[PDB]
Amino acid sequence: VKLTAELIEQAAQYTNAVRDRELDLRGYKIPVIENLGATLDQFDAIDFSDNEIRKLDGFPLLRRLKTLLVNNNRICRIGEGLDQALPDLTELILTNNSLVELGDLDPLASLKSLTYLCILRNPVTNKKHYRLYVIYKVPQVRVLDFQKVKLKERQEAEKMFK
């Protein structure tokens, strides 16, 4: 069940609860993110929850995409050119995925508008200094794992890793 143009065209399309245009791509068992061209850059949000995607990569240039819900997939790596295809990405929800090393979260530093980030229920979470590492390497984030990035944490992350 390839993510195909035909698949996207019959997919529930609606205005979500936070007033954004969202496309519903839940529970299709998609393994690879591809063929997004067919959405025609018409969505503010794309819901990819409960699928089998391994890597957050493969996006076309999508100027309107601001929210990516990627819950319960198998994300173990993040693509390197994400800001070049998603310039205004502001919210990224990665709860319950497979990111294991702090260094695998490095590609998120290039998403200049990224403000809401959630990486809960990922092995990487239990790594020593996981929170400070994210704060220093992705300073554009204001809310991390539903907790406010505070000044004291920023300073503390400036010492360690300076």
């Binding site: 609860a17 936070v18 819901d47 819900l69 809401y116 959630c118 539903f146 907790q147």
Partner: protein, 94 residues
């Protein structure tokens, strides 16, 4: 209070602006199923609370058990099944 499509949350940090609260609520609760809508006001009466509505009932029950006391913006949230059925649910059913 029987299982319900809508969950009632209280004990929330009322300093978060309304639109940010609703967007984080949506994000957090999307992991269990499609959230149809969220009702949250900052009036004196309703501040620190929110109603989260899900398409599927199993999603509401799972959310309730798994996020009971989850630290959200600094406080442990308290979740419960809503007393009544949500207007949106009643309209979607009949």
């Amino acid at each position: 209070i029987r299982p319900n499509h809508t969950i009632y949350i209280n004990n929330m940090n009322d300093k978060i602006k309304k639109e940010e609260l609703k967007r984080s609520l949506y994000a957090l609760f999307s992991q269990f199923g499609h959230v149809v809508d969220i009702v949250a006001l900052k009036t004196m009466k309703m501040r620190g609370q929110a109603f989260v509505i899900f398409k599927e009932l199993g999603s509401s029950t799972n959310a309730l058990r798994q996020l009971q006391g989850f630290p959200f913006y600094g406080k442990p949230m308290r979740i419960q099944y809503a007393k009544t059925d949500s207007d949106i649910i009643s309209k979607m059913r009949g």
